[PDB]
Design a protein around this ligand. Structure first.
Ligand SMILES: Nc1ncnc2c1ncn2[C@@H]1O[C@H](COP(=O)(O)OP(=O)(O)OC[C@H]2O[C@@H](O)[C@H](O)[C@@H]2O)[C@@H](O)[C@H]1O
Length: 161
C-alpha cells in the first residue's frame, strides 16, 4: 500500500485527477483561492453546506469528485490548535481517499493562502499532507502556484525516499 507524490505548479481547477481536494471554509460557500477556482469550473461538486473545521466532505459531480476540506484559519486560531486542525483536515481527506478507494488525487496546500494569517506555511502544510496521505494508496498531485513554492515542494517530496 504505497502512495506517490508529485508536484504541479498550476491552477488545481485544471487537474486531470478525478478527485480534487478543495480548501474550504466552515460555511461551505465560495471562495477566493482554490475554492473560488473550483466553484468557477465545477459548481456541481459543491453542496454549499457547512463543514466542521478539520473535517472534510465528498461531493460528487459528473466531471469531478471534490473533497471539500476545512483547514484552520490562522487568523482565528492559535498556532497549536491550528496545527491540530490542519493535521485533522488532512487526515479527514485520507479517510475519504481510503473509504472510496481513490487511486489518484489532487491536493492543494491547505491553510497556506487565505487562511495562512500571512505566514509562509508551505512546510507546515506539506508535512501534514504527507503524514495523512502516507496512509493511502493514492498517486497524489500536490498543487501549488508559486515557482518558488514549486522548487521547495519538489525538493521536500524528493528528500522523502
Ligand atoms: N487555483 C489554484 N490552484 C492551485 N493552488 C492555488 C490556487 N489558488 C490558490 N492556490 C494556493 O493554494 C494554497 C491554499 O490557499 P487558499 O486557496 O486560500 O486556501 P486556505 O489558505 O486554506 O484558505 C481557505 C479559505 O479561502 C477561501 O477561498 C475558502 O472558501 C476558505 O474560506 C495557497 O498556497 C494558494 O496560493
Amino acid at each position: 500500500k504505497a502512495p506517490s507524490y508529485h508536484v504541479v505548479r498550476g491552477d488545481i481547477a485544471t487537474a486531470t485527477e478525478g478527485v480534487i481536494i478543495n480548501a474550504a471554509n466552515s460555511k461551505g460557500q465560495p471562495g477566493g483561492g482554490v475554492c473560488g477556482a473550483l466553484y468557477k469550473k465545477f459548481p456541481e461538486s459543491f453542496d454549499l453546506q457547512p463543514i466542521e473545521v478539520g473535517k472534510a466532505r465528498l461531493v460528487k459531480g459528473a466531471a469531478k469528485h471534490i473533497i471539500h476540506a476545512v483547514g484552520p484559519n490562522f487568523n482565528k486560531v492559535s498556532e497549536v490548535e491550528g496545527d491540530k486542525q490542519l493535521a485533522e483536515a488532512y487526515e479527514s481527506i485520507a479517510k475519504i481517499v481510503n473509504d472510496n478507494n481513490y487511486k489518484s488525487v489532487a491536493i492543494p496546500l491547505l491553510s497556506t493562502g487565505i487562511f495562512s494569517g500571512n505566514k509562509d506555511r508551505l512546510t507546515q502544510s506539506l508535512n501534514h499532507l504527507l503524514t495523512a496521505l502516507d496512509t493511502t494508496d493514492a498517486d497524489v498531485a500536490i498543487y501549488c502556484r508559486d515557482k518558488k513554492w514549486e522548487m521547495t515542494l519538489k525538493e521536500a517530496v524528493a528528500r522523502r525516499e
